Each structure stands twice: as structure tokens, then as C-alpha cells.
Amino acid sequence: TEIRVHQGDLPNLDNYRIDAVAVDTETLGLQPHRDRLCVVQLSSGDGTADVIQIAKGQKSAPNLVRLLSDRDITKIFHFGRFDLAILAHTFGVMPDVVFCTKIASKLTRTYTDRHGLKEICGELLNVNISKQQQSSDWAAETLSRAQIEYAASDVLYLHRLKDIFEERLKREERESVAKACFQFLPMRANLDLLGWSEIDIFAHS
Amino acid sequence: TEIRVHQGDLPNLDNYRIDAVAVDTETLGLQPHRDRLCVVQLSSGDGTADVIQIAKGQKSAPNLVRLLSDRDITKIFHFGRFDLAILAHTFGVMPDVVFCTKIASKLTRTYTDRHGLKEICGELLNVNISKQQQSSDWAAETLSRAQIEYAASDVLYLHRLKDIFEERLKREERESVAKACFQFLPMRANLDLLGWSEIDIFAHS
Amino acid sequence: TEIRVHQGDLPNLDNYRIDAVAVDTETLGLQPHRDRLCVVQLSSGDGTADVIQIAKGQKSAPNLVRLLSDRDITKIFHFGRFDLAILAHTFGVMPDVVFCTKIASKLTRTYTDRHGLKEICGELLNVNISKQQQSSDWAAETLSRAQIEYAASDVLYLHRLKDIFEERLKREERESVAKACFQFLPMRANLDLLGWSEIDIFAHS
Amino acid sequence: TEIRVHQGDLPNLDNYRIDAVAVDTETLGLQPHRDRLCVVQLSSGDGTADVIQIAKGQKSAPNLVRLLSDRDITKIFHFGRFDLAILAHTFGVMPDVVFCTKIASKLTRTYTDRHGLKEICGELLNVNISKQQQSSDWAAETLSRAQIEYAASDVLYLHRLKDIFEERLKREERESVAKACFQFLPMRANLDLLGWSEIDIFAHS
Amino acid sequence: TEIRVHQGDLPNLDNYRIDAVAVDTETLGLQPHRDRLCVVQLSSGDGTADVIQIAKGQKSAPNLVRLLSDRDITKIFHFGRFDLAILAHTFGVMPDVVFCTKIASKLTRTYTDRHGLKEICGELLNVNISKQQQSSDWAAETLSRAQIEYAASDVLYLHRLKDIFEERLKREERESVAKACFQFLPMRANLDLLGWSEIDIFAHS
Amino acid sequence: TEIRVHQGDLPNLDNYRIDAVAVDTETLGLQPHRDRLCVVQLSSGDGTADVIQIAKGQKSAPNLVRLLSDRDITKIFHFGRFDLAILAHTFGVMPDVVFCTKIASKLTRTYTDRHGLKEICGELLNVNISKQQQSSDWAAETLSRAQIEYAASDVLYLHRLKDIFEERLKREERESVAKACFQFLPMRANLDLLGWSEIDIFAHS
Amino acid sequence: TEIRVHQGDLPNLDNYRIDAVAVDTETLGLQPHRDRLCVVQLSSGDGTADVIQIAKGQKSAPNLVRLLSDRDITKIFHFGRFDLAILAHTFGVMPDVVFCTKIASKLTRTYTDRHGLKEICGELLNVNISKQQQSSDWAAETLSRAQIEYAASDVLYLHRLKDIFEERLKREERESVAKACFQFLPMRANLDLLGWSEIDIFAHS
Amino acid sequence: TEIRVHQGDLPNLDNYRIDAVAVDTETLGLQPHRDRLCVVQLSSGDGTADVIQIAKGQKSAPNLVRLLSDRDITKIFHFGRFDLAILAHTFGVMPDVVFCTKIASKLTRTYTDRHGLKEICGELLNVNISKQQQSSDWAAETLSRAQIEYAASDVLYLHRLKDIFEERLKREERESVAKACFQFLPMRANLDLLGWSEIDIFAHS
């Protein structure tokens, strides 16, 4: 593998002249108002990944923000509801072209109730994701090798999942449903930032 | 007030050359695959209402459906998540320009947890709606006077609520939030028809 | 109203040469092995009722048992699951031609979740049943007038509900589903007596 | 083990001139209106199995349906409440002569609260069923070897279970209870198809 | 009615040379280690009552304790599990000849799930007890007249209830069960004082 | 009752040269980051009240904040945990000399589980506060007379409650407990503002 | 581990002229009215056991019942609440001199919440009991060797536990509490048989 | 290791002329009024520990208590809410300079929901603490070697955790929050002793 570790921002976009980029984040917790962004992960799908450490109080990441803002590049997330919220809270730019593998899983893997990334990777690809480092100090000044390898491991497979999920969505005739869900997902994240994170806004009660 | 009761369909659209129409339905229950549409209510906001009795097995209602599919007319519902589902299930056309007073309530009446139509009308307009007839035989060949008056009372006030809620949404600066939620609402109803009625598609679990 | 009160048994069957008889019971509680049968109520639907006081330890009631065993007469209950159980446990005869207004309500009154007899009588007939005496000492040697009037009131109206429910079951094309449920109801009662009263035998868990 | 895989239908019924056939299904999920039938597996009890792939949108399987309809042949299921529902929804024929190992287990294996197929096969036969493939993509164009072997594994042992459960029902004198439950099971499945899937129709609440 | 109010203790036992005495207490709450005894009420059953105010830090009440210790007098309580605990904690004497109307109700009023004193008095005697003052400041130096009348109302009817419950226990042949329960009740109270107040010591879990 | 309504701030502190001031607030909801402070209520205990309307986006109120910052004046709240949070969030000043009647009630009224202000006022003073207006649009440009009267009602009685609670805390010897709770209360409110509003920080789980 | 297996009853009590006997039962389930007693195991504490197979419908076991009735012999159970109930229901003799290791554990092992026999034997004696056979067909005409060894394992250690628990009860000064609980235990079992198996007779609700 | 085991008290404080001491206790359970203190574990942070057995009824341990009350020495606990309560209940002295690793975890390890000592030690130091002996008979006159090694293991690592948590609290800017929580912790423990152990005193309900 190749994992390029950076401080603050990508040096340039030379490796990202592509149609879709897999994106993930790591934070200090589940509450964007309390838990700061610590890591941003990117991959072009070529089997390598970039891991960008975000400093405390960092307000800008121009190359990263260009990627997040570019409407011609689909950002692939797993449970993007969270990542979109924390990214918008941190850098002030809300992505609007997204694909979420968790929503896709809920729309296609109807034969199971386990939609976590580990189960998806195990079932669809026979790839073992190790989650031991998921609960670790992502704010450490120097990330461990195990942390760096885990962070890259979270983004290395999202392209293959998107390909398979697009096949399943086409087969079961949910393409327009999925497209509408992804179109609404950024606004669901915005509602999370504004204070309705514990509320299903569409529920009767 | 004036309540016009019809069999099958509106006679014409002479009374509905307006910018927005309030819409409600009555059914045999909460499950569209089991519980047929029995009554459709409409109002232009002029203090009169149309109550349309729908026959068993009726597949077509051209004037009503013509109104429902006119993209230049906003359809106002209370808890449109249900009504959109049953309308699309019955006539095969899903409206795509809607306003829902319950979503608006959840976005503006943040000081209460009661978002039912009775509580909203009581608080916002000091109008008392009596719900006694809500659980009644809406499939009766001849509706009683009490049933007809309840059905009209369900649609007579939605225009005034839309006006007030639009004022509140602009005042608290959540207009674009409401717009995005309303834009997504028809697909949420479609998801209900397809089999996800008990699932919040954006939740982690 | 006319209420004929008897000790032990009917004097004869002169008043019960009919197609259907409404039957109900009162007991000391919900557990047939602990709570003894105290009252049996009967009515032909002609506005009169028979109330039969059962003695402690009484094992036989030949006229009552002849009615309960007579396959040519349908026995109408409300929540017959219990009444069938207590009747079979007391007299050793399980009726097998029955109609239950609770099953019929659950199959037809799909627009509400309140299926008790008080609510059914209120909604279908505008008749007010008072339940204050439901929890009383039914084993008293002398029943009070309020007790006797309530006991008769439990059976005076089951014919009118059966007639209406039969109309609704025909209307929604659920006649065979209800008929099969009524056919199975006695074995559900036997399962209750044998010890599965707290178990839904068809559930996954 | 020989497992014969067919497309669409059996070529003939030469292997099924028997008094009882074990039947199971696999689907895309628990909701018959959304999740199509994908595989049907049968066995005569001779240690071999037939695995029939059902195509998307397939409406007919004349040989299979003739087998399912033959009243001289008892159909053995595990949790037939589901299989009967999905079979009737897909091919339009409701089997009416059935034996269910889950009902039998609940009526005889009263010393445990675990009635899943894994526990029954483990306790009664010391046979290890591996369920890893239960949650898999059963709609795949080509089934995997693991999928095929699991699907066959779900019918290979049902005859021996039926024999033992029949022994237990005779020993504990519960034969007529079980018979009435099995006679009613197809109507429970029909009720399931009609929209009462979440309701125990006999419960007080 | 006649209510004699005393400070600290009875002046003498001239009114309590009787076979059975009704006893009740009031405290500052449900936790004997935190909530001190404030009032003790007594009655000979003649329609009059004694209300004894207990002082802060009071360790002795010789005449009252003489009454509580005399094994030839049955002490009648409602929910004696609590009163025994608070009395033993306060005066160091655990009564051992008791009758509890709550246990008697649970052993006899099997036709209801409402075993409060208000409901019992309403059903068995048609006497209306008003509980508004049940939750009040019982530590006041001078009790209000409404408080005193409530306190007397708690003891005025326990003799009549004991007579009726003894009739019911004889009628349903449960006297020896009740007797064993009453003998164990003081040890249940001791278990409460020792720290097992939240544990059913006889439960499986 | 004299109620002075002001915009933005008190005109001066001529009426608040006192040793304790009753304070309460009204907002658009329970979430300080989403629901803005709308009204501040004050009372000197002289039977008059001041109601201060806070504008949207208002960042300063020098006279009010000077009063809130003054360590020689105890601020009396009911459920100050919330009021302290919203006040500190709005004006940037956290009061540090406080008394909370709800904590005091939980430390003294151990005989009840109802600690709301309405319930407290009913029990201790026999004064009926009507809360119908508690859930209303507090951000309206012009408050109704009923709203203003309710708002004054939430501060008019806190002094009298404080006097009674101080007597009870002295009587039951819990003064130092209450003092320590009040000393931590501002930090509990800060913890709420920082993101632990749903976490009991001292619980084991 | 000498294990003597008998049909119907012990031949005599020649091996049981001792002061205390360990007793445990096996049944078809938890409900004495439905599930019959299948096996009774006894031990004198000398490291050997007797396993007595009870036939369906067996009403008499004179030597065994003689042992159960001998008031000079303490019967040791684990969770005797169940065993006493099923023994009394089956043979008509209610033991009245008992020791229960579960009550003793709840009164002594206050540092844990896991009181099952496996955990007690593991912690207190470092002896491993294997519970695999607990859920098995105890009504088999011939028990397997594994069943026999498990059944003996249930009684082989109860004497040592009784010795240690008696030491702990003396040490912690809880002997009279335990004695009262053991004295009450037979009536708790009788209450289970009479129909209160789901009711805590001493609870407020 | 160098675990020194003592009866009753430390011989002197010659080894404890230090700025911070790790403290941990072992009891018979979670309820200080019932379950006595059995062991106190101390460490200077030098990799050695002192394990002090406390005798039944012992009220004094002057050298240990002198250390506990020396305000120039911070006492480090894990979940001091419990330890402080049992120490104060046993010896009558409440420490007032404390650090709690559970509060520190809840304020810093926001990326996990597991705050037990085992999980903290595993994550922060990669040290495996085995908790098998946590639930054991701590009142034995002679503790086993396994008990002694576990007891020392609970205190051997608290200094290293305090050092890391102090680094995290400074880095994340939460020192004044933690300081206020630690200042309130002794009053939370006092509240536990007084009877509010099950009440979060700051909650709305």
C-alpha cells in the first residue's frame, strides 16, 4: 500500500483528477459542537490513500475544500450524515454531491439488519476491517502506525462498494429512490448541526 | 360554512383557480396496502370545502388528480407523509410541490412537543377542532352530518396555518430548511409505499 | 328491561328455540384454575336476559350445558377466548360453534386501536355501557341490583353488533378469514386452559 | 451430497411420489410485498435435495405448484407462517396441508425457550447447522457453493424432526391441539399477507 | 367524628383493653433510614381515633410500645410492610401479631388490580377517602384540621375491612395461607430495614 | 399586580437595591444553542415584577448583566440549571450566587415526587399558578396580557418559597448539602453548555 | 461418583439414616400444572447419588415421600421455591424443614448479582458444573449417561454449600433472617401452585 | 510488586511523604449501610502497594485516616463516589482534595462509551487488568494470593493515568470544569450516605 500523511492540507490535486473520491473523517466524538475534526481521509480508488491531520483551530484547507466543493466529483462516505455535518462545521463548506454506502445498504441489503462497515466489507468483499483503533486518541500529535493503517483502511474499499451497490440498486429498481435520498442527505446533516440530531423530522411522534 | 359533497370526482375546476389548495384524506386506517381511501377533502381557503366520497375500487378521479399533478399549485397537508402515500397508491400520481404543516411545526414550534392538528389550531388560532369522529366508519354509503362537518374542519384552516408558518420560518431563518424537507417529502412517502414505513432511512441503526 | 335470575340452571329451554344465543360469564378473575365461575348470562336478543347464579363447587348445569353443546346454535361472545376457557374448565364442555365480537372488531374496525365492548357499543350503537361494576364480588350470595343490571347489559346488545359486523365482514371481503378464526377460537381457549395462556403460539418469539 | 439445482421448475415429479415433502424458501427479506422469493429447496427425505432458482418476476412454476397443492402430501416447514405467505404471494396457491416444526417445538420442547432450527437440530440430532449464509445475497445470478450447501442443509433434516415431534405429541397427548394449530396455520399466513403481520389476532391487547 | 390528639405518647391504655387495634403511621417518606416517623394513629374500632404526634429524636413511647408488644392484641395495618419497618426503626420493637389488608386484598380481591386503600374502602364499604393530604408536611409543629381528619380517616375503617376479609378468606378457604403470610410479614419488614428493600428475596431473578 | 415591561434592559437599578432577587427566563425551547432567550423576568419580592423583552441577536444588557454579576445579591431560580445556561449563553456572564427551589424541594419535600413550580406553590402556599401560556410564542413582537401575567407569575412567589425552604433545610439539618449543591450548580450549567447536557457526569453509567 | 439409578422409588431409606439430604428435581418445564416431574435426585452428602425416574402419572412413592415428610431431616434445595411446588403437586406431601442455597446466596453473596448454581459452585468451590444437559428430554424412557451425570452433579455439592452458607450466616449475624425465610419458603411454593406464580405477594404493586 | 499486607492500620507514613496517593477499597457490596469495608489499597506510585485488612466493627485507623485527611496530598480514586462514601461511613472523615479517573475519562475520552478501569487501562497504557476477583469474598480472614495481586493491581496504575488525564484536560481546556466536579464529588458522596444514592439531584426528573 501507499499512505501519504500530510499536515494541514493536500499539497496539490495532482493525484485527484478523477470523477469520484472516497472520503472519511475521524473526530473526538459524536457531537460536532463539542468534538473537533482530527483526521481527514481521502483516496482516489487506486489502492493508495492520503491522511491529512487537521490542527486544532484550523479554519481553512484550500485544496481539500476545493475537492469538497467541486460539484463534478462525487464524495463517497459511509454514514455521510455524520461526516458532512462535521466537515461543514469545521470548514464552512457543505458538500452537495454525495453517495452514502449506509443508505445504499439499507436500500439493498434488505435481508439483514447489520449495516455496519465491518459487516458490509466482510460480506461483499471478504475483506477484514479491524476496528480496534476506532476508539483511540485521534487527536494525538503523532498517530501510531496502527492508527495510520486503520485510517487508510477505512477509505481503500469505498469505490468497490459503490460499484456493487450501484449494481444492486439497478437490479432492484431503487435508483431514483437512492438519488433522492442522497440529494436530501446534506440537508439532514445541516439539521444535525442546527439541533435536530435526536429528532426524526418526518416521524409522527 | 358551505360544504359541497360529491360522488367520485369534482364536477370541474372552476373553484380551484388558486395558488394553493388545502388537501386532506380519510381512510380505513394507517396502512395503505390494507386500508382504502374513503374521503378526499379540499378547500380554496374561501371558507368553503369540497368533500369527495371515493367508491370502492375507484381507480380514476380526473379533475381531482388534475389538481394534484399541477406543478404550479402548492398542495398543503397536515402530516402529508401519510396522505401523499395513500394518494399515490390510489391514483398513481405523486405530487411533487407540497407544504406540510407538521414539518413546519417541528421546525418552528420548538417550545412544545405536541404537534397534532388539534394542539396547533388551539394554540395558534384559538379554534377548537373536535376529533371525536376521527375514528368512525368513513366507508359508510351516507356520511352523517357530524362526519361531514369534521372532515371540512380538517381542511378549513390549513391556509391560515401556512401563512403563519411561512412568517415563522422566515423570522427564525429556517426557510431553506423547510424548502428542502418539503422537496424530500414525496420520496419519503414513496419509501412508505415500498415497504420502509417503519424505518428512518438516515439513522445509524 | 326484563332480567330472569335463576339458581344453578335454566328451568327449561322454552325461550331458547332460536338460531343464535348471546352468552357471557363473570368470574372471580382472569385465571381459570384459580378463579371460579360465578355468573352466566344468556339472551335471545329479544331485550330480555337470563342471569344464572353458579354455586361454589357446582359441576353440572344440564340446560345450560345443552345450549353450550348444541351445534345448531351459534354462541356469541365478546372476547370468547376467556369465556370459552372458563366454561370448558367448569362444565367439561368446549363449545365449537362460536362468534367473537373482538376478533370481528380487529378484522373490520381497523381505524381504531380501542376494541373493548364499551367503546364498540358507544361507536356502533350510541349506547353507553357503564363498567363500574365489572370489578366487584361476583360470588356474593345475593347480587345487588346494580350488579344484575350490569350483567344483563353485557348480553343485551351482542346480536346487534353481530349483525353489523357480519355486514362489514361481507363488505370488505373478509368473511372467510373471520370464519376460520372463529373455527380456531375453541382450540385457542383449550391452549389457554393447558398452560400456554401467555404465549402467542405462532410468533417467532 | 448430491444437490440438484434447477432453473424455474422441476423437470418432473418422478422423485416426489411420496407422502410428505420438506419445503423451505429463501428471500430478500422478511416482508413479502417488498422482498421477492429467490430460492425454493425441496427434499424427499432420501438425503438429497432440489434447489430451484426463481427468476425475478416469475409468476408460475407448474410442477412445484402441483406439488404444493397435492392434498395427499403433507408439506413440512420450519416456521411455515412465513413460507406459506411468501409462496402464496409469489405463485398464487396457498398450501393447506402442513406440518410446522416451530409450532411442534413450542408444544413439546417446553423445557427450553430457544426454538430456532439451529437449537432443534443440535439437540434432537446432534447435527451442526451453519447459518453464516442465512444473511447473504440470495438474488445473485449464480449461487455460491456455500449458499447451495446451506440451502440444501435447511431441508435435509426435517423428516427426522417430524418423526420425533410426532412421537412427542403422541407421548404427551397433545395430538389434537397440534392438529388444530396446523389446520389454522395457512389462515395465519393469509392474515399475514393482508396486513396483520404485527398483530396477534387473539390477544386482548 | 371524635379524634383525640396527643403529644409524644398515649396518657394511658384505658381505651385499648380490646382484642384488636387498628394501627397506622405517617412519615416524611418511603425510606426509613432517611424519613423520620411523624404521626402514629390508633383506633379501638368504636368510630373514634387517637392521633399521636411523635417528636424529632424521640426514642421511646412506653404506652404505645406496651400496646405494640402485647401478643394478645392483633395489630391491623394497611401495607404493614412499611409501617412495621418505620416502627421498628423508631422504637426498637417489631410487632409480631399482625393483619395486613393489602395482603388480604391480594389474596381475596382477585377480580381487580387496584389494591389501594381508597379503592378498597370505596368498593367494600362505599366510604370515600380523600387522599389529597397524604403527601403533606407531616412534621409541622401543629397539624392542620384537614391533616388530622385525614389521619383519623386512615384508621377508622380497618376493623370493618378485617371483618370482611376474614369472611372472604374463610369462604374461599385461604385462611392458613394468609396466616403464614402474616407471620412472615415482620421478617419482610426486617429485610427492608437491613438493606434488601428493593429485592424480592424469593424471586428467581 | 404591577408589571413593568421593558425592551432590551432595565432603565436603571433603582428598584433592585436589595439582597436577593427572583429571576426566571423564557426562551423558544430547551436547547440553548438552538432556542434563543426571549424574556427575562425579575422581582424584588415587593409584589411587583419586571419583564424584559430580549431582541433577536441581542448580545448585551449592561444593567441586567451588572445585577447578575453582583456577588452580594443571591439570584433565586426555579430549576436554575436551565436559566443559568441560557443566561450565560446569551450575555456571556455566569451567575455564581444562586438558590434553586427545585434542588431545595428535592432535599426537603421527600414525601412527594412532584417538584414542579405549580405543584410546589399549590402545596406550600395554596396559590394556583396556571401554566396554559407556558407553551406559547414568546418571540412575538407584542406579548399578550395573559403571557405577561403568566411570566410575572413565575417570579412573584420565589422569595416566599425561599423563606420556607430555608426553614425546612434548617429543620432537617441539610443546609450544608444545599449550599454545596448551589455552589456546583453554575458548573453543571457550564457542562450543559459545553455538550454534556444529556450525561449525568457522576453516574456509574 | 457412584450413581444408582432406580425406577419409581428408592427401595428403602437404609442409605439415608442421616441428618440432612440434598434434593433436586428435573421436569419438563417451569409450570407445575402442565409439566410433569420426571426425575428426582438425592444424596446423603457422601459423594454418591440416587437418581429416581418417575413414570408418567405416578402418584405414590412411599419411601421417598416418607423421607420428604421426616421433620428431623433438613431438605437442601437450590431454588426450592420450584422443587417444593412440583413435589407437593405430584406426591401430595409438602416438606416443611428446608434449606435453600439461593436464598442463602442472596443473603450472603451481596458482592455479586449472579446467583446461579454454576456461578456459586465455580466461585465458592472452584468446581466446574457443565449445564449443557439442563435443557434435555428428561422424560426419555432411558436417560443417557450424560443426563445421569449432570443430574448427579446438581446434588453432589449442596452439602458443602450448605456448610459454607451456614458459616456465613453465623458470621454476618443473619441467622434468624435466614431461618424465617426458610420457614416461609413452603408457603411461597404453595402460593405458586395456587396461581400466584407471577405475583410478589408483598409488593406494593 | 512488593505488596505489603497489614492488619488494621499502616505502621507509619514514612513511605508516604508524597504529593499524591492512589486509594482504592474493597467491600461486600454497593450499599454502604449494609456492606462493610474490608480492604484499603494504597500506593505511593513507585510500583509497590499496601493492602490493609479492616476488621469487622473497626471504627478507627488513625495513621491511614491522617493520610486521608492531609489536605496537602491529593487522593486519587477511580469512581470516588463510592470509595469516599464507604470511607466516610466507616471512619467518619471525608477527604476534600481528590481526583477521580472516572470524571476525567468522561471529560476527555469522548470517543468511547466504555469508562471502566479495565477499558481505560487497556486503551491508555496497553496494560491488561484481570477483573475476575472483583466479585469475590473480600471478608475472608486471610486473603488469597490472587485476591492480593488483584487488589494491588487496582491502585498500581492510577498515578500514570492521572498524569495522562492532566495532560488531556490541559490540552482540551477543561481544567476548571474538572476542578469544579472534583470539588463537588465529596458532597455527592455525602448525599449517597444520606439517602439520595439513586437520585441525580440536578435532573429535571
XYZ file of N, CA, C and O in Angstrom, chain B residues 108-112 114 123 168 171-174, chain F residues 27-30 34-35 56 135-137 139-140:
96
model
N -40.628 25.054 13.815
C -40.868 26.400 14.325
C -41.400 26.386 15.744
O -40.980 27.204 16.560
N -42.308 25.472 16.060
C -42.881 25.384 17.398
C -41.974 24.525 18.276
O -42.334 23.447 18.737
N -40.763 25.030 18.487
C -39.740 24.316 19.235
C -39.993 24.327 20.733
O -39.293 23.625 21.469
N -40.972 25.099 21.192
C -41.321 25.217 22.598
C -42.376 24.218 23.051
O -42.886 24.346 24.164
N -42.738 23.250 22.222
C -43.720 22.259 22.629
C -43.383 20.934 21.964
O -42.656 20.886 20.971
N -46.125 18.783 21.317
C -47.415 18.359 20.783
C -47.599 19.059 19.445
O -47.782 20.280 19.399
N -53.597 26.436 19.864
C -52.596 27.408 20.283
C -52.507 28.586 19.320
O -52.489 29.744 19.748
N -43.155 32.467 10.395
C -42.238 31.989 11.427
C -40.949 31.439 10.834
O -39.859 31.696 11.359
N -38.815 34.306 9.833
C -38.342 35.034 11.007
C -37.187 34.318 11.696
O -36.202 34.956 12.080
N -37.271 32.995 11.848
C -36.216 32.233 12.510
C -35.173 31.720 11.529
O -34.293 30.950 11.917
N -35.286 32.119 10.268
C -34.304 31.885 9.208
C -34.090 30.401 8.917
O -32.960 29.923 8.804
N -35.197 29.670 8.793
C -35.181 28.242 8.503
C -35.958 27.962 7.225
O -36.411 26.836 7.005
N -37.741 31.121 26.927
C -36.981 31.004 25.669
C -37.852 30.298 24.643
O -38.988 29.930 24.992
N -37.346 30.152 23.425
C -38.026 29.389 22.391
C -37.881 27.878 22.530
O -38.374 27.156 21.657
N -37.229 27.371 23.566
C -37.157 25.937 23.750
C -36.049 25.537 24.702
O -35.398 26.375 25.321
N -35.848 24.223 24.789
C -34.983 23.596 25.781
C -33.522 23.485 25.361
O -32.712 22.992 26.148
N -29.916 26.263 20.057
C -30.932 26.491 19.043
C -31.984 27.515 19.453
O -32.440 28.292 18.612
N -32.375 27.547 20.723
C -33.576 28.251 21.158
C -33.194 29.498 21.947
O -32.721 29.396 23.082
N -33.945 39.490 19.160
C -33.143 38.536 18.414
C -31.767 39.110 18.123
O -31.639 40.248 17.671
N -46.354 27.073 27.131
C -46.045 26.783 25.732
C -46.786 27.769 24.838
O -47.923 27.540 24.429
N -46.119 28.880 24.533
C -46.642 29.889 23.625
C -45.474 30.519 22.880
O -44.308 30.271 23.191
N -45.802 31.365 21.906
C -44.794 32.035 21.083
C -44.221 33.227 21.834
O -44.702 34.356 21.720
N -41.475 34.747 21.316
C -40.726 35.679 20.485
C -41.595 36.724 19.801
O -41.067 37.540 19.042
N -42.902 36.716 20.045
C -43.797 37.684 19.427
C -43.377 39.109 19.766
O -42.940 39.396 20.881
